[PDB]
């Protein structure tokens, strides 16, 4: 069981207002045929236009909510809405475009999908709350056939051109007019009671209904993300490398070690309470502090309430020493904390829009993160940049310009002049730091944290 069988039944109740008289007994095979597509008994990598929930979860980066509303159906204009916020009007002759024929609407669809998806995925997955018009509109902008490769590269083809009779991926499709071998999934097949808005609004207050096709397209994809990543979590699913994943994860490990060591030394805490991942390792192994771990998986729905993490009777005294919350999202951090909190608002190829202000951060695994909330950090302050090192000043083994910086906390800078080794290490650490910040991570620390206390650790 790899793909969705075309002989699987498809519930047609949601389709009968736009398509009256539709048979209750229906397969994907018959539905695809009714949509104007012929699969010709083809065993060439595209067995079904529709896919399973498990296949959709593996391809979450390709998700594009799609809805079609009858503006007035052969004789009436259609409003095509996409979870990108785009609304196109197709005439049969929050962005709102005026009525145009399909031959130009399809050019716009290919440009919009290519620009949104070229740095996310090798395909498109149309996420539907199917009522009929969206399925019957597909023949006007979609072509299907055997799996193909791009004419300019080795990537799979996602677009087709009638002008040149050629195929292209999302990177090489400028001037292409047809979406080729798209995938799709009808959320209404998952077993829901009531309409789209009533199921969406149960879990999300961020997406409203301005009564346009893009609002429904947005709500549909949000509801699909809630079902697949919020109420259901699967951290075994691996996702391909599409950007700076490796550099970001390595930077996160460097910054954590740097900041936690410096806190321990500067304030000499006797105990550290490490709250978060149950598979966490001591980030400063050569530490003399009493290191105590507390297990909490990444919260994907709402941030943990500090009252439930800490209270109901462990050291018991979380007020003793320091608390380390490294990607452990809580509602209000205690004053004696060191915190790394992912900012869901960040724009990047790793961060996809999520449910109720949250975001879906996809880096090796998929992690739905509750909305970033500035009030969580009232007891703390922003952690400023600094580099600390007690390692020997020794080059060993890239050209040089001398480093001058008030934030290079080293014996050499204390002594008046930064050595080559510590300048190279400072510059590498500043690059790792900037990578992690730009990726969306934000750092917070207890108000008494002062790097001035690190200079006396050189005596
Ligand atoms: C300084 N602290 C805090 C606990 C402490 C406080 C006072 C004396 C000893 N240990 C460390 O755990 C530590 C970190 C990095 C290197 C070496 C020791
Ligand atoms: Zn290509
Ligand atoms: Zn929503
Ligand atoms: Zn040095």
Coordinates of C-alpha atoms and ligand atoms in Angstrom, one line a residue:
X1 CA 0.0 0.0 0.0
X2 CA 2.1 2.9 -1.4
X3 CA -0.4 5.0 -3.4
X4 CA -4.2 5.6 -3.1
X5 CA -6.1 3.0 -5.3
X6 CA -8.2 4.5 -8.0
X7 CA -10.8 1.8 -7.0
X8 CA -11.1 3.4 -3.5
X9 CA -14.6 4.9 -2.8
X10 CA -15.1 8.6 -2.8
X11 CA -17.9 10.1 -0.7
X12 CA -19.9 12.4 -3.1
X13 CA -22.3 14.1 -0.6
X14 CA -20.2 17.3 -0.5
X15 CA -20.4 17.5 -4.3
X16 CA -24.2 17.2 -4.9
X17 CA -25.1 20.9 -4.6
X18 CA -22.8 21.9 -7.5
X19 CA -23.3 18.5 -9.2
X20 CA -26.9 17.4 -8.6
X21 CA -27.7 13.8 -9.3
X22 CA -24.2 12.7 -8.6
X23 CA -24.1 8.9 -7.8
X24 CA -23.6 8.0 -4.2
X25 CA -21.5 5.0 -5.4
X26 CA -18.3 6.5 -6.8
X27 CA -14.6 5.6 -7.1
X28 CA -11.5 7.8 -7.8
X29 CA -11.4 6.1 -11.3
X30 CA -14.9 7.3 -12.1
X31 CA -14.4 10.8 -10.5
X32 CA -11.1 11.4 -12.5
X33 CA -13.0 10.4 -15.7
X34 CA -15.9 12.7 -14.8
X35 CA -13.3 15.5 -14.3
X36 CA -12.4 15.1 -18.0
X37 CA -9.1 13.2 -17.5
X38 CA -8.1 9.9 -19.1
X39 CA -5.5 7.7 -17.3
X40 CA -5.3 5.1 -20.3
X41 CA -4.1 2.1 -17.9
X42 CA -0.8 3.9 -17.5
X43 CA 1.9 2.4 -15.1
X44 CA 4.2 5.4 -15.4
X45 CA 4.7 6.9 -11.9
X46 CA 1.3 8.7 -11.8
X47 CA -1.3 6.1 -10.6
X48 CA -3.9 8.6 -9.2
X49 CA -4.4 12.4 -9.2
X50 CA -5.6 12.0 -5.6
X51 CA -3.3 10.9 -2.7
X52 CA -3.5 9.4 0.8
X53 CA -3.3 11.5 4.0
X54 CA 0.1 9.8 4.7
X55 CA 1.5 10.8 1.3
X56 CA 0.1 14.3 1.8
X57 CA 1.9 14.6 5.2
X58 CA 5.2 13.6 3.5
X59 CA 4.6 16.4 1.0
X60 CA 3.2 19.2 3.3
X61 CA 5.6 21.7 1.6
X62 CA 3.7 21.2 -1.6
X63 CA 0.3 22.1 0.0
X64 CA -1.8 24.8 -1.8
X65 CA -5.3 25.2 -0.6
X66 CA -7.6 25.6 -3.6
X67 CA -11.3 26.6 -3.8
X68 CA -13.6 27.6 -6.6
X69 CA -16.7 29.7 -6.1
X70 CA -19.4 30.3 -8.7
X71 CA -19.2 34.1 -9.2
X72 CA -22.6 33.9 -11.0
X73 CA -20.6 26.6 -14.8
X74 CA -20.2 26.8 -18.6
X75 CA -22.2 30.1 -18.6
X76 CA -20.9 31.8 -15.4
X77 CA -17.6 33.3 -14.2
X78 CA -15.6 31.4 -11.6
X79 CA -13.6 32.8 -8.7
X80 CA -10.4 30.7 -8.2
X81 CA -8.9 31.0 -4.7
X82 CA -5.5 29.8 -3.5
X83 CA -4.0 29.7 0.0
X84 CA -1.4 32.2 -1.3
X85 CA -4.3 34.8 -0.9
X86 CA -4.7 35.1 -4.7
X87 CA -8.2 35.3 -6.3
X88 CA -8.5 35.0 -10.1
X89 CA -11.7 35.4 -12.0
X90 CA -12.1 33.0 -15.0
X91 CA -14.7 34.0 -17.7
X92 CA -15.9 31.4 -20.2
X93 CA -16.2 34.0 -23.1
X94 CA -6.9 39.1 -0.4
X95 CA -5.7 39.9 -4.0
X96 CA -8.7 40.4 -6.3
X97 CA -8.2 40.1 -10.1
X98 CA -10.9 41.0 -12.7
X99 CA -12.5 38.5 -15.1
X100 CA -10.2 37.0 -17.8
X101 CA -10.4 34.0 -20.2
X102 CA -8.8 30.7 -19.2
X103 CA -6.0 30.9 -21.7
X104 CA -4.5 33.8 -19.7
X105 CA -5.7 32.6 -16.2
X106 CA -3.8 29.4 -16.6
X107 CA -0.5 31.4 -17.4
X108 CA -1.0 33.2 -14.0
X109 CA -1.7 29.9 -12.2
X110 CA 1.6 28.4 -13.4
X111 CA 3.6 31.6 -12.5
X112 CA 2.0 31.8 -9.0
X113 CA 2.6 28.1 -8.2
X114 CA 6.2 28.1 -9.6
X115 CA 7.1 31.2 -7.5
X116 CA 5.6 29.8 -4.3
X117 CA 6.9 26.3 -4.7
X118 CA 10.3 26.3 -6.5
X119 CA 12.2 26.5 -3.2
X120 CA 9.8 24.2 -1.2
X121 CA 8.9 21.1 -3.2
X122 CA 9.2 19.0 -6.4
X123 CA 5.3 19.0 -6.8
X124 CA 2.0 20.7 -5.9
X125 CA -0.7 19.1 -3.6
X126 CA -4.1 20.9 -4.0
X127 CA -5.8 20.8 -0.6
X128 CA -9.6 20.8 -1.2
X129 CA -12.9 21.0 0.7
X130 CA -14.5 19.6 -2.5
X131 CA -17.9 20.9 -3.5
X132 CA -17.7 20.3 -7.3
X133 CA -16.6 23.5 -9.2
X134 CA -12.9 23.1 -8.1
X135 CA -12.8 19.5 -9.5
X136 CA -14.6 20.5 -12.8
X137 CA -12.4 23.6 -13.2
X138 CA -9.1 21.5 -13.3
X139 CA -9.4 20.4 -16.9
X140 CA -9.0 24.1 -17.9
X141 CA -5.4 24.4 -16.4
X142 CA -4.2 20.9 -15.7
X143 CA -2.6 18.3 -18.1
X144 CA -1.7 14.7 -16.9
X145 CA 0.4 11.8 -18.3
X146 CA 3.5 9.8 -17.6
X147 CA 6.1 11.2 -15.0
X148 CA 8.6 13.3 -16.9
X149 CA 11.8 15.3 -16.3
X150 CA 12.3 19.0 -16.9
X151 CA 13.7 20.2 -20.3
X152 CA 16.4 22.3 -18.7
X153 CA 17.3 20.0 -15.7
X154 CA 17.0 16.6 -13.9
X155 CA 14.0 17.6 -11.6
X156 CA 10.6 16.1 -12.2
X157 CA 8.3 18.1 -14.5
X158 CA 5.5 20.1 -12.9
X159 CA 4.5 22.3 -15.9
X160 CA 3.7 21.9 -19.6
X161 CA 3.9 24.4 -22.5
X162 CA 1.5 24.2 -25.5
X163 CA 3.6 26.8 -27.3
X164 CA 6.8 24.7 -27.3
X165 CA 5.4 21.1 -26.6
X166 CA 7.9 20.9 -23.7
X167 CA 7.9 20.2 -19.9
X168 CA 9.5 22.0 -17.0
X169 CA 10.0 22.0 -13.2
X170 CA 9.0 25.0 -11.0
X171 CA 12.5 26.6 -11.6
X172 CA 12.3 26.6 -15.4
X173 CA 8.6 27.2 -16.3
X174 CA 8.6 30.9 -17.3
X175 CA 6.0 31.2 -20.1
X176 CA 4.4 27.8 -19.4
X177 CA 0.6 27.5 -19.4
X178 CA -0.3 24.1 -18.0
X179 CA 0.1 22.6 -14.5
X180 CA 1.4 19.1 -15.2
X181 CA 0.7 16.0 -13.0
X182 CA -0.5 17.9 -9.9
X183 CA -1.6 16.0 -6.8
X184 CA -4.7 16.7 -4.7
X185 CA -6.6 15.6 -1.6
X186 CA -10.1 16.2 -0.4
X187 CA -10.3 17.0 3.3
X188 CA -14.0 16.4 3.2
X189 CA -13.2 12.6 2.7
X190 CA -11.7 12.4 6.2
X191 CA -15.1 12.3 8.0
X192 CA -16.3 15.6 9.2
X193 CA -19.7 16.9 10.4
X194 CA -20.7 20.3 9.3
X195 CA -19.3 22.8 6.8
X196 CA -15.6 24.1 6.3
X197 CA -16.0 27.2 8.5
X198 CA -17.6 25.4 11.5
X199 CA -14.7 22.8 11.6
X200 CA -12.0 25.4 10.9
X201 CA -13.2 27.9 13.6
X202 CA -13.1 25.1 16.3
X203 CA -9.3 25.3 16.2
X204 CA -8.4 28.7 14.7
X205 CA -9.4 32.4 15.3
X206 CA -6.7 33.9 13.0
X207 CA -8.3 33.1 9.6
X208 CA -11.6 34.8 9.1
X209 CA -14.2 34.5 6.2
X210 CA -14.2 37.6 4.0
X211 CA -16.5 35.4 1.7
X212 CA -14.0 35.0 -1.1
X213 CA -12.5 31.8 -2.6
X214 CA -9.0 32.5 -1.1
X215 CA -10.4 32.6 2.5
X216 CA -11.9 29.1 2.0
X217 CA -8.6 27.9 0.4
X218 CA -6.7 29.3 3.4
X219 CA -9.2 27.8 5.9
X220 CA -9.0 24.4 4.1
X221 CA -5.2 24.2 4.3
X222 CA -5.3 25.4 7.9
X223 CA -7.8 22.7 8.9
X224 CA -5.6 20.0 7.1
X225 CA -2.5 21.3 9.0
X226 CA -4.4 21.1 12.3
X227 CA -5.5 17.5 11.6
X228 CA -2.1 16.3 10.4
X229 CA 0.3 18.2 12.6
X230 CA -1.5 19.6 15.7
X231 CA -4.0 17.0 16.9
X232 CA -1.9 14.2 15.4
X233 CA 2.0 14.3 15.6
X234 CA 4.5 12.1 13.8
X235 CA 8.2 13.0 14.4
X236 CA 9.4 9.8 12.6
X237 CA 8.7 11.4 9.2
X238 CA 11.8 12.7 7.6
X239 CA 11.8 15.6 5.1
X240 CA 14.5 16.4 2.5
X241 CA 17.1 19.2 2.8
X242 CA 15.9 22.3 0.9
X243 CA 18.1 25.0 2.5
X244 CA 20.3 25.8 5.5
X245 CA 19.0 23.0 7.7
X246 CA 22.5 21.6 8.6
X247 CA 24.1 25.0 9.2
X248 CA 21.1 26.1 11.4
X249 CA 21.1 22.9 13.5
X250 CA 24.9 23.2 14.0
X251 CA 24.6 26.9 14.9
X252 CA 21.8 26.1 17.4
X253 CA 24.1 23.6 19.1
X254 CA 27.0 26.1 19.2
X255 CA 24.9 29.0 20.5
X256 CA 23.3 26.8 23.3
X257 CA 26.7 25.6 24.5
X258 CA 28.1 29.2 24.4
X259 CA 25.2 30.8 26.3
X260 CA 24.7 28.2 28.9
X261 CA 28.4 28.0 29.8
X262 CA 28.6 31.7 30.1
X263 CA 25.5 31.9 32.3
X264 CA 26.9 29.2 34.7
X265 CA 30.3 30.9 35.0
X266 CA 29.0 34.5 35.3
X267 CA 26.4 33.7 38.0
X268 CA 27.8 30.4 39.3
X269 CA 24.3 28.8 39.8
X270 CA 24.5 25.5 41.9
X271 CA 21.7 23.8 40.0
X272 CA 20.3 23.9 36.4
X273 CA 16.8 22.6 35.5
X274 CA 16.8 21.5 31.9
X275 CA 13.1 21.5 30.8
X276 CA 12.3 20.1 27.3
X277 CA 13.3 17.3 25.0
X278 CA 13.3 13.9 26.8
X279 CA 16.3 12.9 24.7
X280 CA 18.4 16.0 25.7
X281 CA 22.1 15.8 26.5
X282 CA 24.1 18.1 28.8
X283 CA 25.0 21.0 26.5
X284 CA 28.0 22.1 28.7
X285 CA 29.5 18.6 29.7
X286 CA 32.5 19.9 31.6
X287 CA 30.1 21.7 34.0
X288 CA 30.4 21.3 37.8
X289 CA 26.6 22.3 38.2
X290 CA 24.0 19.8 39.4
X291 CA 22.2 19.1 36.1
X292 CA 18.6 17.9 36.4
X293 CA 16.4 17.0 33.4
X294 CA 12.6 17.3 33.0
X295 CA 10.8 15.7 30.0
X296 CA 8.5 17.6 27.9
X297 CA 7.9 16.9 24.2
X298 CA 7.5 19.9 21.8
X299 CA 4.0 21.4 22.3
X300 CA 2.3 21.7 18.9
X301 CA -1.2 23.0 20.0
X302 CA -1.0 25.7 22.8
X303 CA 2.2 26.7 24.8
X304 CA 2.7 24.7 28.1
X305 CA 1.3 26.4 31.2
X306 CA 4.2 26.9 33.6
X307 CA 1.8 26.0 36.4
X308 CA 1.4 22.5 35.0
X309 CA 5.1 22.0 34.1
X310 CA 6.2 23.1 37.6
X311 CA 3.3 22.5 40.1
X312 CA 1.3 19.6 41.5
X313 CA 4.3 18.5 43.7
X314 CA 12.3 16.6 41.0
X315 CA 14.4 19.2 42.9
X316 CA 10.8 20.7 43.6
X317 CA 12.5 24.1 43.9
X318 CA 12.7 25.4 40.3
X319 CA 13.4 28.9 42.0
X320 CA 16.9 27.5 43.0
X321 CA 19.5 28.1 40.3
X322 CA 18.6 28.5 36.7
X323 CA 16.0 27.0 34.3
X324 CA 16.9 26.1 30.7
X325 CA 14.0 26.2 28.2
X326 CA 15.7 25.4 24.9
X327 CA 12.7 25.3 22.4
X328 CA 10.3 24.4 25.3
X329 CA 7.4 26.8 24.6
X330 CA 5.8 27.9 27.8
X331 CA 3.1 30.7 28.5
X332 CA 5.3 32.7 30.9
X333 CA 8.9 31.9 31.6
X334 CA 10.1 32.2 35.2
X335 CA 12.6 35.1 36.0
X336 CA 15.6 32.7 36.5
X337 CA 15.6 31.4 32.9
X338 CA 17.8 30.9 29.8
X339 CA 15.4 30.6 26.8
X340 CA 15.5 29.8 23.0
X341 CA 12.0 30.4 21.5
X342 CA 11.2 30.0 17.8
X343 CA 9.5 33.1 16.4
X344 CA 6.6 31.7 14.3
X345 CA 6.3 35.0 12.3
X346 CA 9.7 34.5 10.5
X347 CA 9.6 34.4 6.7
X348 CA 11.7 31.4 5.3
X349 CA 11.5 28.3 3.2
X350 CA 11.6 26.1 6.4
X351 CA 8.6 27.9 8.0
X352 CA 5.2 27.2 6.5
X353 CA 2.0 29.0 7.7
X354 CA 0.2 27.1 10.5
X355 CA -3.0 27.0 12.6
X356 CA -4.2 29.8 14.9
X357 CA -1.1 32.0 14.5
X358 CA 1.2 29.1 14.9
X359 CA 3.6 27.9 12.1
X360 CA 4.8 24.6 10.7
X361 CA 8.6 24.5 11.0
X362 CA 10.0 21.9 8.8
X363 CA 13.7 21.1 9.3
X364 CA 14.4 17.3 9.1
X365 CA 11.1 16.7 11.0
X366 CA 7.8 18.7 11.0
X367 CA 7.1 20.8 14.1
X368 CA 3.9 22.8 14.5
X369 CA 4.7 25.7 16.9
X370 CA 2.2 27.8 18.9
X371 CA 2.1 31.5 18.0
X372 CA 5.0 33.6 19.1
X373 CA 3.9 35.7 22.1
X374 CA 6.0 38.6 23.4
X375 CA 4.2 38.5 26.8
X376 CA 5.8 35.0 27.5
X377 CA 9.1 37.0 28.1
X378 CA 8.0 39.7 30.6
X379 CA 10.3 38.4 33.4
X380 CA 13.4 38.2 31.1
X381 CA 15.3 40.4 28.7
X382 CA 16.7 39.8 25.1
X383 CA 20.1 38.1 25.2
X384 CA 22.7 40.3 23.5
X385 CA 25.3 38.9 21.2
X386 CA 28.7 38.0 22.7
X387 CA 31.4 35.4 22.1
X388 CA 33.2 33.9 25.1
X389 CA 36.3 31.6 25.1
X390 CA 38.7 30.4 27.7
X391 CA 40.7 28.3 25.1
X392 CA 44.4 29.0 24.6
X393 CA 45.5 31.8 22.3
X394 CA 47.2 29.6 19.7
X395 CA 46.8 29.7 15.8
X396 CA 47.5 26.0 14.7
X397 CA 47.3 25.3 11.0
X398 CA 41.9 32.1 5.2
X399 CA 43.5 35.6 5.3
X400 CA 43.5 38.2 8.1
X401 CA 42.4 41.8 9.1
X402 CA 42.8 42.4 12.9
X403 CA 39.6 42.1 15.0
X404 CA 38.4 44.9 17.3
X405 CA 35.3 44.1 19.2
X406 CA 33.9 44.9 22.7
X407 CA 32.0 41.6 22.6
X408 CA 35.0 39.2 22.0
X409 CA 35.3 38.0 25.6
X410 CA 38.8 36.5 25.6
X411 CA 42.1 36.7 27.6
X412 CA 43.7 38.3 24.5
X413 CA 41.1 41.0 24.2
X414 CA 41.4 41.6 28.0
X415 CA 45.2 41.9 27.4
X416 CA 44.6 44.6 24.7
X417 CA 44.8 42.7 21.4
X418 CA 42.6 39.8 19.9
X419 CA 44.9 36.9 18.8
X420 CA 44.3 35.4 15.2
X421 CA 42.8 32.2 16.6
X422 CA 40.1 33.9 18.7
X423 CA 39.4 36.4 15.8
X424 CA 38.7 33.4 13.5
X425 CA 36.6 31.7 16.2
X426 CA 34.7 35.0 16.9
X427 CA 33.9 35.5 13.2
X428 CA 32.7 31.9 12.8
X429 CA 30.5 32.1 15.9
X430 CA 29.0 35.5 14.8
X431 CA 28.1 33.8 11.4
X432 CA 26.5 30.8 13.3
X433 CA 24.7 33.2 15.6
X434 CA 23.2 35.3 12.7
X435 CA 22.2 32.1 10.8
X436 CA 20.1 31.0 13.9
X437 CA 18.6 34.4 14.5
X438 CA 17.7 34.8 10.8
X439 CA 16.2 31.3 10.8
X440 CA 13.6 32.6 13.4
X441 CA 15.1 31.7 16.8
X442 CA 15.0 34.3 19.5
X443 CA 17.2 34.3 22.7
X444 CA 16.1 35.5 26.2
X445 CA 17.9 35.5 29.6
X446 CA 17.4 36.4 33.3
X447 CA 17.7 40.2 33.9
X448 CA 20.9 40.0 36.0
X449 CA 22.9 38.4 33.1
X450 CA 25.9 40.6 32.5
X451 CA 28.9 39.7 30.3
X452 CA 31.0 42.1 32.5
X453 CA 31.1 39.1 35.0
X454 CA 32.9 37.0 32.4
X455 CA 36.2 39.0 32.4
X456 CA 37.2 37.8 35.9
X457 CA 37.1 34.2 34.7
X458 CA 40.6 35.0 33.3
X459 CA 43.0 35.5 36.3
Ligands
LIG1 C1 30.5 27.4 36.7 N1 29.5 26.4 36.7 C2 28.2 26.6 37.5 C3 28.3 25.7 38.7 C4 29.4 26.0 39.6 C5 29.4 27.1 40.4 C6 30.5 27.4 41.2 C7 31.6 26.5 41.2 C8 31.5 25.4 40.4 N2 30.5 25.1 39.6 C9 29.6 25.3 35.9 O1 28.9 24.3 36.0 C10 30.7 25.2 34.9 C11 30.5 25.5 33.6 C12 31.5 25.5 32.7 C13 32.8 25.1 33.1 C14 33.0 24.8 34.4 C15 32.0 24.8 35.3
LIG2 ZN1 14.2 22.4 -14.4
LIG3 ZN1 -7.0 28.9 10.4
LIG4 ZN1 43.2 34.7 22.0

